[PDB]
Amino acid sequence: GKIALQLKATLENITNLRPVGEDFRWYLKMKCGNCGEISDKWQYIRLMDSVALKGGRGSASMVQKCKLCARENSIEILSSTIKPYNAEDNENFKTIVEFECRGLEPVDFQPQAGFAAEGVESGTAFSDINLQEKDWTDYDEKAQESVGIYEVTHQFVKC
Ligand SMILES: [Zn+2]
C-alpha cells in the first residue's frame, strides 16, 4: 500500500518549498495494520537509511517488529514522489511525498527542519527552514520584502 502526505500552508512571497537532502527527517507516528498499535514516540525516517527487504521486494527506509503483535512491518519514502509546495498551491492540500507501506501506515506528521524555499520573484534561496512551530518568517533583501509560511497543516490520503 501507498499513502500520500499532503501539506497546506499560507504562503507570503514564497515558492518551491520542499524537503531537501538524503538526511531530511520525516517525523511520523505509525500504526500497525495488524493490531492497531500506535507507538507513543515520534519516529523519524530518512532516505539515507535503506534496508534490503526479502524476496524481490526491494528496499525500505525503516523495518520494525511491532511491539504488541510482533509482525515485521516496514515503510519506504519514495524519492521520486517528493514534490515542492509552490505559490500556486497556496492554501490547498498538495501531496509532497508518498510512502510505500508494508503493514505500517503513517498516521501523524511533525514537520521540523531541512526544508528549503525561494523568494517568488527574487529567486533568493532560503535554506534549512524549520516548520516545527507551523509558522516561519524571514526577509528577502533582494526583493525588499518579507517572506513567510503560515498555518502549516497536513493530512494523509490513500494513493
Ligand atoms: Zn501490530
Q: In angstroms, rounded to a whole number, what is the distance separating the alpha carbons of residues 59 and 75? A: 9
Q: 30 near 109, Cβ under 8 Å?
A: no
Closest CA to 67 of 88, 98, 36, 108: 36
DSSP 8-state code for residue 159: -
Closest CA to 20 of 100, 118, 99, 87: 118
Write out the three cell numbers for 64: 520494525
Distance separating the N- and C-terminal Cα atoms of the chain: 8
Q: In angstroms, rounded to a whole number, what is the distance separating the alpha carbons of residues 131 and 152? A: 8
Q: How many angstroms does the Cα of residue 54 sit away from the middle of ligand 1?
A: 20
Q: In angstroms, rounded to a whole number, what is the distance separating the alpha carbons of residues 78 and 105? A: 14
Query: Is 69 assigned a ligand-binding role in the annotation?
Result: yes
Write out the three cell numbers for 80: 521520486
Q: In angstroms, rounded to a whole number, what is the distance separating the alpha carbons of residues 26 and 78? A: 12
Q: How many angstroms does the Cα of residue 137 sit away from the middle of ligand 1?
A: 41
Q: 99 near 74, Cβ under 8 Å?
A: no
**Beta sheet of 2-12, edge-to-edge order:** 62-65, 72-77, 94-102, 2-12, 145-158, 136-140
Residues 6+ apart with CB under 8 A from 40: none
Closest CA to 25 of 156, 132, 150: 132
Using CB atoms within 10 Å of the CB of residue 33, give its burial: 0 to 12 exposed, 13 to 18 middle, 19+ buried: middle
**Residue 128: which domain range?**
1-159
Query: Is 101 assigned a ligand-binding role in the annotation?
Result: no
For 148, the enclosing helix (H) or strand (E) is strand 145-158
Q: Domain total for the chain?
A: 1
Q: How many angstroms does the Cα of residue 65 sit away from the middle of ligand 1?
A: 8
Q: How many angstroms does the Cα of residue 104 sit away from the middle of ligand 1?
A: 8
Closest CA to 43 of 66, 21, 20: 66
Query: Is 32 assigned a ligand-binding role in the annotation?
Result: yes
Q: In angstroms, rounded to a whole number, what is the distance separating the alpha carbons of residues 103 and 124? A: 42
Q: In angstroms, rounded to a whole number, what is the distance separating the alpha carbons of residues 107 and 3? A: 10
Q: How many angstroms does the Cα of residue 72 sit away from the middle of ligand 1?
A: 8
Write out the three cell numbers for 83: 514534490
Q: In angstroms, rounded to a whole number, what is the distance separating the alpha carbons of residues 59 and 46? A: 13
Q: In angstroms, what is the resolution?
A: 2.0
